[PDB]
Design a protein around this ligand. Sequence first.
Ligand SMILES: [Mg+2]
Ligand SMILES: [Mg+2]
Lengths: 301, 300
Amino acid sequence: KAVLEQFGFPLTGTEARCYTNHALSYDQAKRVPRWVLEHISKSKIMGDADRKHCKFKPDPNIPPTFSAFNEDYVGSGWSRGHMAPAGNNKFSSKAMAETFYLSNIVPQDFDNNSGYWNRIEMYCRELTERFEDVWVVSGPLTLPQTRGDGKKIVSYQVIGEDNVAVPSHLYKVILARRSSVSTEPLALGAFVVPNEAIGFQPQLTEFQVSLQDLEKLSGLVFFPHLDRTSDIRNICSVDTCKLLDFQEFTLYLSTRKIEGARSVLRLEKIMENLKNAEIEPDDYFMSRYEKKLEELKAKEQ
Amino acid sequence: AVLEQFGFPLTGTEARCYTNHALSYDQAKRVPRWVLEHISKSKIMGDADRKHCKFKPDPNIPPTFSAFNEDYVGSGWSRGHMAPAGNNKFSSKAMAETFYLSNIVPQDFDNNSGYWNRIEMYCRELTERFEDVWVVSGPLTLPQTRGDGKKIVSYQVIGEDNVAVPSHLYKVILARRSSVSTEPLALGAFVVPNEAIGFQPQLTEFQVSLQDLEKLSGLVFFPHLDRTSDIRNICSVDTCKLLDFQEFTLYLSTRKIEGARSVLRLEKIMENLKNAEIEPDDYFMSRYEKKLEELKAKEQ
Ligand SMILES: [Mg+2]
Ligand SMILES: [Mg+2]
């Protein structure tokens, strides 16, 4: 070993990199994370940290030769997709900014990012209403497809001068613990979704896979301290694995759009678009709507 | 409350050390990421014989992430050594460990027995002129540009385990003249396609800058090497000259002698050589006559 290592073994750069509220292993060849691990709780997802103040930027800890840059993504047809979501870090301005490091980012389909993936991220946050602690590992995948001649081929686009790899699929592993003292078994689920528009028809369980199958596909071992001989329950059996439906998701989106409205007229389409959508505003929407209406006419026009 | 209560995910990229090579394994692709070896004049000599060796899963790799012989056999791809078995004649154990599938990538048959073999032979030749030679070998999956300008990485995966077939192979060669010489170190990096190449292109046509290979592979090679020091191009201080068609064919025909088991075989090899317009050299005839006498002394 000493003779082979005289000038050092090659470096792969896969060591875990830790930030305020997430950790990741970086793939220097693909310019994307291999896995991103985070812990979620009800306290962390509340706060005044606001994402419109954040900027995507290269991770300052990654050698520039292996880093992605904004020029790789902009105009590529692919969005900068958070693995550790910025929305999980309302409690800390620093933590949310670090999720905008490109070490946490993969090329993600625009509709997937703002749609099905967003709704999965929302479910993970929803779990904190029922579990005191939730752990999530998210990351990209590049899976094979069978060609016309029967051969299996892995094919993916690389974008920008730096050849950032666009994944065919995205995965999440969710581990939930009811409380730090409870004797209730842990709950776990693994999910793989295509990096494309999905819509509202398929239920989340349709994308569920066994942890062992995901580990074989990804070449990773998740949560290695979990005693797999112990009693560990399927999260979609102990919980709902139910994403927001179209009506719920649209009301949620329309409610958030209120806070960004800068004209009484803009504020009026939101309710108009909503109501014609056969979706009645709930009490929270109307509370935020009237508050914003009063604010807008108290500001310069 | 903390993230690591149940552990960070494991990537399995830690360096794995064997008798005369070390590697980092890619558990997703079922191939090594890099394989490092040290070569010397003493190590490439010995009585270790590759005919006794068998390909087998690396016993240290979790079976769920291992390749198996069933993935390769009948796939159209050969089991290609990264650390060559031929560099380990000094130790049967060291040679057996190069037949662990952790050292193996799916390699084009002609490339394996042809251009890559000739590069491997050049690395061994370097031990005649340098006391110490370090070599890092490994696979690559490089993109190709589509008609619309989009760049696409495409590679086959073979077997039930989806072993990744590389588009290219790389070698990084680091040579030191002696433990006491003040001569600067010599380094070269090379990238060849995983396909038949032939004899027209010289090895320097496949040479790339170390920095370029590191960008393509996502690796940093020989990190203790002081790159601000005086480091020379191996193809400037040495020849980077592979055997040509005549030399390589004579070498192959000479090796075929020792495997000949009929006088009719032994005559075919010499006939083929001559029809190739290549005259046997003195070493060929020495081995040829020894085998002819041997075959006449064996049961017919
Ligand atoms: Mg997103
Ligand atoms: Mg070979």
